[model samples]
Target: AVGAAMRDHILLPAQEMAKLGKSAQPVLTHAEGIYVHTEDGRRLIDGPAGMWCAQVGYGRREIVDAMAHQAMVLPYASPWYMATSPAARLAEKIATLTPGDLNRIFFTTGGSTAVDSALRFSEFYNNVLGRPQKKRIIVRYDGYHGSTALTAACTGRTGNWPNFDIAQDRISFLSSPNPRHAGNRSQEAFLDDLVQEFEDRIESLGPDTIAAFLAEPILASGGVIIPPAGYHARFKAICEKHDILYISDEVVTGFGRCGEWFASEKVFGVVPDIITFAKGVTSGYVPLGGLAISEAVLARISGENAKGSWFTNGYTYSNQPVACAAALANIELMEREGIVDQAREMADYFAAALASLRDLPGVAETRSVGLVGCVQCLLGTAEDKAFTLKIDERCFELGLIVRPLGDLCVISPPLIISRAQIDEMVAIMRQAITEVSAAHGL
Candidate 1:
């Protein structure tokens, strides 16, 4: 390690633990914006936007200043008992900004809690409607909801539930409209197959027992798998047909991450009954997440849980003042900087650049939207870490901090990045891809 003793003590354990399973270790020293300074003084670009959150980029002054100011003024205050100014303002502003009639906001500490909140709210709503049997939550295949008990089971990806037994029995699974791994079928055919499978699964479990169908507008963690166009509209219709509540997990896609204020309406034109938001809301400045309930849902469960006598939910720091201040400032920065518009421009150009990689051997396809993208490599017998390590080293050399998930290269740069920076990021990716493919005899 080419750093201080304190840094080594803090980081070495994580790296060492990561190597227990024979995986390559990744060491870091510092990060600023898209670039991260390694222990060896090399800079690497962060293509995958820091777990698809860091919308405003690293070390932003607005976030830092807002956090500092709030900490000095009022570091910790509960919004549950006495609502703070920033928390109230942020909630009202978000209600006005989000699409459709999503008016009510219940803040949480982060995304997982947001999902948990939504699930609890959905269950309570059904109870109020006298549909006590409607308790099952239907989620698509490969959809990433959250890590909590109910939300984790709601996550459609299979990799998460191996050793641990999931507690959320109300979750129902269905196939997703992922055109890539499922095959190169026509848009209509893909959607049809997906819908039919979901219907069959829901029917087997009895539709009356199903409370809602949870989905991510774009499958971010499960390889940025963009569903075919018309898939969302058709799925929404199917949910409506079955009287199942539609919950959109906008945790990764909301707040300009998808070049829209809220991705559900823009990409899919579907008005979800419940929208869970986190990540980019405060752009990782502070921990804050919430559920944006539609007017109908709000009307159903508004006063029942009034003043929280006992709903069996809520965190001690659900709505911290400093977090609210950070979130408010972060939103202000996004608005002032026109981050979504910039994301649109960057996405268009970035997609075009990634398209050029089609001719490169072992490169299957590059999928993207807004500032997030993924390069799924061709089918191969190469070891997982081999591919991961090849790109890992090459990217480090070129100052590009990219990660390979399974066989796909994930890219999700911050929203504040420039066109030139996006171009450069993609260019470096091309070189890394080509070199690796050649080395592997692809």
Candidate 2:
């Protein structure tokens, strides 16, 4: 009955019944460590960790208690005039965790707002420097930023803009350097192509006209494309030469997902001018997101060195006490339990397990970094194209919840997921892929 109500009344994201010709959406009741229970009484492992946010898993009592404590003390405060304890303390904690001199924190309601605010900040920085012409943003093909007007423009996906009226004029897209997509070329050559392409674009566009270049360290929704060695640092160097600010969109890769507090310097050995993060901070216990700015940018934008420097932008929920309290507890819980270290320790095992699936009949390639992974399938015929959804359905029936984006099966389980659970998830995926391959005569 509840599922029926949701199908009838509640609108869904990414197009609904009208597009899929479907009516029922799965009604999840509750979740535990790595599994979610549905209204139909099926318990499935959350392969995407609730869209890659539930890093520490679900039903954490400490997070709940922290929010409740803050709510009881002071549920609301005007962010414009007043500040709260949790908000102030949380910022200090985050400052110590961010890489390089990225110490300034600006909170938002979620990832979208965080990204939107970063773009606005980029423009504001340029405007303050009296460079209004440096307003264009450089985005990479297949990069997913957010859903806001400007952030959506920064996103490189086409479906997000279809018939919705987006500002694509200010956006420039660089080709994604997925080695799997680079036919006939070696991985090194592919990396070279990507670096040269980025440099060429900046030159053609007149680097002075570009304000920032935004990218996901690993393209999440774009099928988790991991560029070759030195791609990030090379791109950052290009940005430096051209005086373009590099914004690392760590909305999905932040927290423990990438086996680190943040993936910028830990995994890529590069420091971004601004880093936008959400998801894992509160582990999906509450809605929260923010950007960490470098000291250089902060000084230029807000320090006394710049006379009359002030940024006139903020959200009502910016630095909300309740959300900050949840974040504080969340970080403490992760540290107390050693979740980040565990993720790093278990990453190789996780990657090896997923890589074994590449030998499956329909799998084209398998890629894994840290705790995130994907199994790409070969699409030869229309029946093979349909196999992606069929495999996902089979996995769901066999007690696993994984995402099928086009010909890719993506998974980013909670960091707390055990090695035994990894085996279980891979076994389920293997069986599902076998069944789908047999059904499609692959």
Candidate 3:
């Protein structure tokens, strides 16, 4: 029986519970490793890893113990002026892992705040340097940043904007360089076109007016979009030439999700001026996110604020001890289990397995990088999207919990999943797709 408290008390994100719509969300009761058990007693493979955060999987005892110990020792501490041992140690650990000299750390509650803080810092940096006009941020089409007002403005997804009163003028968007959208152009020509687009935007928006170019190494919610070769490096060069800061929003791609500590430098060969991370930092053990600032940027602010001035930003729970301890334990567990190396090894097999789905009926395209993958359904209109939803529901019923992003079904299973589990997941997805195709007469 559905509990009375659950029916009347809980309110969910992006939902109108009063209406009882067809798109009602499900409630999961428990999770272990790579699977989550629903209230109906169905065990479904956690294809999205609790929104791509569960890198080390569920039910990690070490993470739990770390949090418990920290909570017992020091449950709450104001992050405004005080420093905690766990926070300091975690910061040091992150400094060592991040590429280049991005050693300065500023912890936030989650991805949105990390991004919000980064943009605010960018504004402050320009203000301190006496260039208040350089406050606009350049984002790309299909990029998903965060849901906060300023960061949401930086996001390129239009659906998040309508009627929300987001300051659209503060952001400039470039067309996404999705390879699948390049109908007649060769790979080289397509990449060149994308690079030209970036240059053109900078020229149109006056380089002196732009503050930074924020991007994700791999566009996670934007259908796992991956740019063509040399795209990131060349684009980053433009930012450098224009004296603009480059921020890599690795909220989804960092912490071994892309088979690396940080995908910006490790996978894409570009070290951004600022990097924001969350999710897998503690593998969802607790709320934790942070910004890793480059040495050059830090030096600039330090020099400007040398005379007893401050950066003047922080949250109530910033660098909470329990969260930091959880992250410390999470990273330690990952290294001990060789989770990052395992993700790298499993990426090829995962990619190949998902690529096979491209041959299925109604599957327009397939893309995979590291362990994340997407299968784009051929949705030409509203009717097609409805049909695709049926297929997603079918997958869920078949014990797979893949994320249905519009018409794209995305999968980012736990990093610990083995080849045998990959085969099982692929088989389930293929069967669901075939059934949906048959039902729709595709």
Candidate 4:
């Protein structure tokens, strides 16, 4: 009854659905492990890890127990004056896991604010250093920061800013180094061109005017695009040389999704100045996100040099006790079970499984890293969004939940997925692509 009534009252996250004030998306009733049960009684494998956040998988009693325990004892912590044990301990643990001297964590409600806070902090960092003109931000053409209006401006994905207002004037876009965008260029040449473009952009814009450079070590929502070799390290070096803050938006890649607690330094070999993380911190059992700030940046705003200045930015629920408690428990459980190592080990099989689909009829390419993969099909053009919905329907019917980003079927399974499960996911995906190809005569 309530489910039926929901279509009228709620605004969903879709373009066409908002046209009629209704949603064509499935209403998931419940989930366990890596499987979600839809209202229509279908049990589909959650391919995207609950929007790529459910790292430890679903139905974990440990996280729930921790949240309940914290809520019962101390539900909330005031952001201004009060602090909680859970938040403090979680901060210490996260600092240890994060690369470099990013020892400071300012929590937010979720990913968008995590990024929004990081961007705001970047501007404030420059302001304290007396460089008020360094307000421009450089993000790649396909980088996705978050959904907040401020962070939305930071994101460079398509269709997001069509009817929306963002600070586009202050933000600049660098061409993505993802090889798919390289056209016919060789890998070495593509890499050189990518670096050259970065240098050109900084030189053209004048590095003094740029505040920060935002990047997803691996672009998740933008079809799982990976930058060419040496991109992360080269860009980090340039950012450091230019005095531009390097902001790694690890909202999707952090917390075991990339087979590590954080992928910036471990996988990509770049320790960013500010790493904004959310999603898997608490395995989506509770809302949490934060910016891991380096000590050098924090120093300017902290002690003697900034006595009369304040970097006034925080959420009302900064470091919420229950959420922090959930993160602590999730981290504890994940470590005890060696989930991160398991993710690393299984990633080889996962990558192989997805890569096996490259020879299919409509598959233009298949690329994967760690537990996430993409199967970009040529079944329909980008203009055929309705065809994307049809493929989504077929994949759903075939007992999979592959996220269809136009022709790109992105797979981000839970970290706990096994070899057999990986094979099953690929098999279902194979059939879905085959069926869709035949139906569309591609």
Candidate 5:
């Protein structure tokens, strides 16, 4: 049972945490760059990028040192009343990187809060305009937003909702826009079908009743699902036509993951009304995330266009100094090293390498964008959680770590990954899948 005591004391993140417990999870003692050295002495490649965040890789000394220095200089600064240099500077830096007028930054403790805050701000935006009934949030299937009650209601990944509950009345869902789901249909026809579904949903729900359309640029949790080429622009147009606020959930895709500060306009060709970002913002060095509001939206919500009420929503750690320091250092480090460019230039090579895995007998298909991807397996029954875990274990034994996502293996290497490391990663995955194929003879 590894350590039975650990199971009784700590609860992990997943809905099945208690059922599986910590015994099955490895305890990593330390990590450096793309490798995690476990307590058992095995040095495995950090493939999943620690839940798709570690953009600059593990053990970044600059980020760590910045946090330490800030903690020593001024540990706590109440965000409610006072602002710190770190928080102020970080926001300014981010504004330059974000697209269009998305300049106003609202800090949060993590991605969930960033998303929840965006959802709340959408409501608040309508509230200021005297349309309280326009409160339904539109989401998509197989999209991951967050774990909070408000955000969870909007999420459709992980089919874990049957055991729990959320605000079903307030949130509405549409189909995932992944092209693979189109089956026999061509990409254009599939995209047209998706557009019709969205328009029909808006008409049935009454466009006025919809407050916002929340979407992840890439559905990371749903096996790195990428939407059809024109999905984003088309959806943005539809939302604009109906006055529905466009909220892009960039929690996993922000920073260098998509080779940009915000992937909405840079990669997807749409400037969202709001953006929620975290994870790679600080590269998992410290807990910090934020929401970006367009200047035009803020004119109504914050400026003199029309607002008399206070936005009574924020956290004590919203602008935590140490966190902001780590983020600032992380961003600056990336800028200094041109990590974004590296991700952009290497994206084609990375995608090709991941696609190569499909040649293996057990691999069904591979999908990827930027530095994240998934290898869908033809070997296992997609519904069997046990089979996926076995795949995870086999990969671990082969000194590579990947996310066993139902019928797929998810990989999110750091944006700094080089050509040789990518080759090594692909080879390891091939070996792991090959060994498993022979063992089961499927």
Candidate 6:
């Protein structure tokens, strides 16, 4: 009954329905480079890059050919007792590319599987090393891990909780650095608070029983909430101090999304023990996910479980050859086109463009780093909330796609976008914000 009400009333109207129709509207009937061709005969810039995965932009003939060639040569092969060429090559490339000696690649089908796999892998790794009691997972609230049994429990978003008796026992939640939420606290104080909370949770749960602490460097999909400066560095330090493994979910922030292959080096200058990644790795053309494990984690598991063999953990499609080929081509394109290079150059411009929208009525705060930006709507007043929604809706109609997670308007366009097009998206948003405020009497 509750599901029916939400699907029929709440979600359908908000354009939040996942599987709406055969096809409602395409923001771009055709896409190339940074722009998308809309059905209305307008070429609109893709500000969010289809959930921020198109690192190489659209219509890359190289990626297409790579996919086609792999499909024809070796159609399908499971990682279960069977191996394919592309998948193997992709795994090697990923192992070498990932940060901080995270050379072991355990592939999954997508982001959710990647997330769930991380906890599961950690659980199994601990069990194999005779530390079966180390089963607890610590995660921050509002973090988007994935939509799986354990991953959902690991997630602190309230939206994922109300469905069923998702009584996942081993997961713990704590406060994270959101300047907007942790108001008036200095960045240092905020970091200290988070670290203390983590220590407190460890004490309550028993430190030796904790397996890993999960984090996303960029905090994507939950409103692009960039934590205060030095927050990540401090988090890593605390994790190390407590002897807890830190897993960085790079499903969104990996590749060129943050003007760097991974936001760890660029933002915090630290490499996590394990980095969970997908999406931009294959540019969303072919689905893939993996865990970049540290040497210690791998050594512990390997030394203990070497003779016992048959890990009995990995997926049937652990590494698909075609998908791996697509990933290889995707990485090549990102490098050749200097996608990350371009994002670094355009970072200031993109930020300033979105930050400029703060002057518009109802705008509370504008936060951005690299290619991601969020125009947070002030919620103290009803008119602000309504006006923010109105602006988002208008921008959607104006050949732009912008989503709001609660009161913040989220945008993470393709990393390959130019400065001029960046300005245009901002211009459209500026107009929408102005028009909505005027219409709603804000």
The residue-by-residue lDDT of candidate 1 on 22-67, one tens digit each, is 4334567677877767666777787777677889888888988998
lDDT of each: 0.79, 0.89, 0.89, 0.87, 0.87, 0.78
Which stretches of model 2 miss by more than 4 angstroms? Answer: 17-22, 379-382
Tell me the deviation in Å of residue 242 in model 2.
1.9
lDDT of 5: 0.87
Position 91, candidate 2: lDDT: 93
Q: For candidate 3, lDDT tens digit of each residue in 255-349?
A: 99989989998899898999999999999878999999999877876765544447889899999999999999999999999999999999999
lDDT of 1 at 209: 92
Off by over 4 Å in 4: 15-18, 383-388
Which regions of candidate 5 fall more than 4 Å away from where they truly are?
1-5, 15-22, 383-388
Query: Which prediction has more favorable lDDT, 1 or 6?
Result: 1
Superposition TM-score, candidate 3 onto the true structure: 0.96
RMSD of 4: 1.6
- Which consecutive 10 residues in model 5 have the weakest lDDT in total? 379-388
Better of 3 and 5 by lDDT: 3
lDDT of 2 by residue, 294-354 (tens): 9988787565656687788999999999999999999999999999999999999999999
TM agreement with the true structure for every prediction = 0.91, 0.97, 0.96, 0.96, 0.96, 0.91
Name the lDDT of candidate 4. 0.87
Worst lDDT window (10 residues) for model 4? 15-24
**lDDT tens readout by residue for model 6, 200-293:** 8889889888889898886777778777777677778877876678889899988887888778756666678888888888887778887777
Please identify model 1 stretches exceeding 4 Å from their true place.
Answer: 1-27, 181-185, 303-312, 379-385
Off by over 4 Å in 3: 1-7, 16-23, 304-308
Who is ahead in lDDT, 3 or 4? 3
- Supply the global lDDT for candidate 6: 0.78
Count steric clashes of candidate 2: 0
